[PDB]
Structure 1
Amino acid sequence: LDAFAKVVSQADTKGEFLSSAQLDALSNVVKDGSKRLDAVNRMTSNASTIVANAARSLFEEQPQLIQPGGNAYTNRRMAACLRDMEIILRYVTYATLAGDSSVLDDRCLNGLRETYQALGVPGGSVAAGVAKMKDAAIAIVNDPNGITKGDCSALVSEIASYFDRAAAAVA
């Protein structure tokens, strides 16, 4: 409704009906909103798979994490690791829904590096796990089956930026 009211102001200033350009512009706002909801829906609905695929890739790459002495050794520690990735993924979907990183920053990333240091969690391995969630999430967002075909590339880039910001915040 924000973009619609601004277009009214512009048309009224001209004293004209909406132009074809203004109608296509507003139509693209509605299309972008719908694509954004598909991305949030696909990431939300598949949240456990995104977490599991990333964790599997991280542990296979960094087996020390789940060998004796590792920070994610024993299932109890492993489970808390999966829970952390779920939390970060949750705030990435919030950012995707809102179109900005304000909640992701204020509620999740601000001070998170310092929580991990208080705990001895290796933030650089959290960053790798977040970057792997990114790739799993994007493969799910970009799957063309089950959805109206179209371009989601700008949205996928924006989603990648949220994952990269979260990873860089904890490294």
Structure 2
Amino acid sequence: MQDAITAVINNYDVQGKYLDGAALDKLKAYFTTGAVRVRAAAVISSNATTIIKEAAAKALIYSDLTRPGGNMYTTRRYAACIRDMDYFLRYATYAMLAGDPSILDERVLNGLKETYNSLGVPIAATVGGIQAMKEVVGGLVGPDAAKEASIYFDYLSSGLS
């Protein structure tokens, strides 16, 4: 994966340039944002189970999906869906700390569409769930953190769709 600090380094390395003040400023910018990000991440980790619960309640459950003939019908499928939700949450948290969307592309986004199509999992419903998680997360993290958190959630959603 890549993070903001490494991104700056890599750009300089391809140029072969030693680190310069302009580069330092970009790094400095990240460092200020960092403290906020760490606080947000801790909030998400503690409330992860609840975030998933709330989001599922908002979109997935009490629906045709959970009813027989629906994708999330049967215990095994239900458990799989909530496991997937957790993945999305954990990776988004990783991305938020990193300050880079690349990890999402390298781990989550790559081959997901194809996997889902073979499985028969409904992509639009999954996207709906991700959006729901974003809304719940936004509340817990608070406004400044929410903007940063939202972009990664949206990135996942756009990739899947």
- Asked if TM exceeds 0.5, the reply is yes
Partner residue of 2:76?
76
Larger radius of gyration: 1
Partner residue of 1:86?
86
Aligned AA for 2:126?
V
Preserved CA contact (<8 Å) 2:60 2:129: no
The percent of aligned pairs where both chains have the same amino acid is 41
TM superposition shift of 1:31: 3.9
Out of 142, 146, 152, the position equivalent to 1:156 is 146
SS in 1 for 2:138: helix
In structure 1, distance between residues paired with 2:147 and 2:83: 25
TM superposition shift of 1:167: 1.5
TM-score where L is the length of structure 2:
0.79
Preserved CA contact (<8 Å) 2:59 2:128: yes
Aligned AA for 2:135?
D
Partner residue of 2:96?
96
In structure 1, distance between residues paired with 2:95 and 2:83: 19
TM superposition shift of 1:69: 0.3
Q: Which has the higher contact order (CA 8 A, sep 6+)?
A: 2
Partner residue of 1:167?
157
Preserved CA contact (<8 Å) 2:54 2:136: yes
In structure 2, distance between residues paired with 1:168 and 1:93: 17
1:136-147 equivalent positions in 2, closer than 5 A = 136-142=136-142
Aligned AA for 2:44?
M
TM superposition shift of 1:168: 2.0
1:51-70 equivalent positions in 2, closer than 5 A = 51-60=52-61, 63-70=63-70
Distance 1:74 1:8, change over 3 A: closer
Partner residue of 2:114?
114
Preserved CA contact (<8 Å) 2:137 2:146: no
Cα deviation code 1:8-30 (max 9, x no counterpart)? 998xxxxxxxxxxx9xxx5x754
TM superposition shift of 1:7: 4.8
Aligned AA for 2:72?
A
Aligned AA for 1:78?
Y
| Residue ranges of structure 2 left out of the alignment (5+ in a row) | 9-18
Partner residue of 2:132?
132
1:8-47 equivalent positions in 2, closer than 5 A = 30-47=31-48
TM superposition shift of 1:82: 0.2
| Residue ranges of structure 1 left out of the alignment (5+ in a row) | 11-21, 143-151
Aligned AA for 2:49?
S
In structure 2, distance between residues paired with 1:7 and 1:47: 39
